[PDB]
Amino acid sequence: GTILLDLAPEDKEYQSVEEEMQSTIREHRDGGNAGGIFNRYNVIRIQKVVNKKLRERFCHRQKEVSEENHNHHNERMLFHGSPFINAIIHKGFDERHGGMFGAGIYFAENSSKSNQYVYGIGGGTGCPTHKDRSCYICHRQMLFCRVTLGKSFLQFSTIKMAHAPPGHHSVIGRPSVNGLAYAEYVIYRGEQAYPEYLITYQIMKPEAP
């Protein structure tokens, strides 16, 4: 099964994962409705997910994508937030489980974008205990994943795709809202992502203005 490797805070790998998570916080158009109000996270722990079958399935797909993309995986480290997090670390990503780019598995460069989905779409009803989307008490988890993009198809309008377009492996969707769009990285096969880092954290309440 799955083994969780515990990274130490003094490790460079722990520090780079934290830095990527802290530096990619941005303001969201919903004004903090989904993920809460914060400028920084309190990182509780960073764990490396080790699972032989998930790694085998990921290697196998990686090789296929490489062959169709002039021997390039086109791998990127991206954030993912989901109420399925526990099933992801044990069984892997599952495309069988509304998005602006069709029935895919969505990844963001912004950690704050993935934080909006910890409790489900639009932040759901928030944490189970306080029903608070901006809870500063309850521990949250998000993933920092290896994502095999291969040949990405560039999408600029909302389209309901079932699979990557012919000859392609992923979709880079930019959904325009009043002319502004942040990229969403979409895969349509769970084996095209590995849940490399499990980050346990809290959002932090900014000091009163």
Ligand X SMILES: Oc1nc(-c2ccc(C(F)(F)F)cc2)nc2c1CSCC2
Closest CB to ligand X among residues 26, 52: 26
Which chain residues interact with Zn ion by CB under 5 A? 127, 129-130, 135, 137-138
Please pick, from the candidates 51, 62, 82, 170, the single residue that binds ligand X as defined by CB under 6 A.
82
The answer to whether 60 is annotated as binding is: no
129 binds, among ligand X, Zn ion, none (CB under 5 to 8 A by kind): Zn ion
How many residues touch ligand X under the rule CB under 6 A: the total is: 16
- Helix or strand holding residue 75 (H, E): strand 75-80
DSSP sequence for 107-167: EBS-HHHHHTTTTSGGGTT--TTT--TT-SSS-EEEEEEEEE--SEEEE-S----SSPPTT
The one-letter code for the residue type at 28 is H
188 binds, among Zn ion, ligand X, none (CB under 5 to 8 A by kind): none
The minimum distance between CB 203 and ligand X, in angstroms, equals: 15
Closest CB to ligand X among residues 34, 46: 34
